[PDB]
Amino acid sequence: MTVKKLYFIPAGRCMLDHSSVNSALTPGKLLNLPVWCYLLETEEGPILVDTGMPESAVNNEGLFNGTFVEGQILPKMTEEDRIVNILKRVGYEPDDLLYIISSHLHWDHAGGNGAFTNTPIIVQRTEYEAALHREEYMKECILPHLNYKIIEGDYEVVPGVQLLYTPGHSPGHQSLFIETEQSGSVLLTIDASYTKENFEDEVPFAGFDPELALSSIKRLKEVVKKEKPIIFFGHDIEQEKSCRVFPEYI
Ligand SMILES: [Zn+2]
Ligand SMILES: [Zn+2]
């Protein structure tokens, strides 16, 4: 009826311009932001939420040189941050997992998806379809022959694990509402808000459709008023300071 453990697992980092967390801002200063994956230990088995950055980012800050985001995005990833290595340390191999949940298919959330060729990968149909053609999607993030479990809208993965459709930051972005044994209700916004102020204060941030992102935030706020969860944001360096991370769980 509840998830036994929820682990916050650091998966490397990334430098972005600060206008990414506040659209109104003028570019110049850099921000070293956390990249996260999460692992859920459940009665039915372990579930991994997101898979970190692509192998091409390892020891390669200059990954995006040449492209349309040169200098605006610098991955900070070492060999330890490869998702397979992360799992090996938590104590699993890819084929051990019950499901992978892709919040969305941006490079910092699905770069490791290719490592999982048997596990069903739960992703929104609108995200998948967008990844097939929009330019912000890397080939590592859409590989054609993985075992996708394509869903549309809200969805219960296993008891205590609910996906909430929250498009806007990307066309098919989804957040998680989790009931854990130790903490009760937890809302993982993922990138439906990078920071606490994108959420509470509705400050605009990096995204595909800000009108949609705002209505997804208002939808999450209705949920919060009802369930009163503890809430964790997608890329928030102030909140990161106090987050209990692996090997602690919540
Ligand atoms: Zn994203
Ligand atoms: Zn992200």
UniProtKB/Swiss-Prot annotation:
Designated gene of the protein: aiiA
Self-association state and partner proteins as the record states: Monomer.
Binding site for Zn(2+) 1: H104, H106, H169, D191
EC number: 3.1.1.81
Organism, scientific name: Bacillus thuringiensis
Keyword set includes Cell cycle: no
Molecular function in Gene Ontology: acyl-L-homoserine-lactone lactonohydrolase activity; metal ion binding
NCBIfam families: AHLLactAiiA
Domain of life: Bacteria
Catalysed reaction, written as an equation: an N-acyl-L-homoserine lactone + H2O = an N-acyl-L-homoserine + H(+)
Protein name according to UniProt: N-acyl homoserine lactonase
Cofactor, how bound (note): Binds 2 Zn(2+) ions per subunit.
Gene3D superfamilies tied to this protein: Ribonuclease Z/Hydroxyacylglutathione hydrolase-like (3.60.15.10)
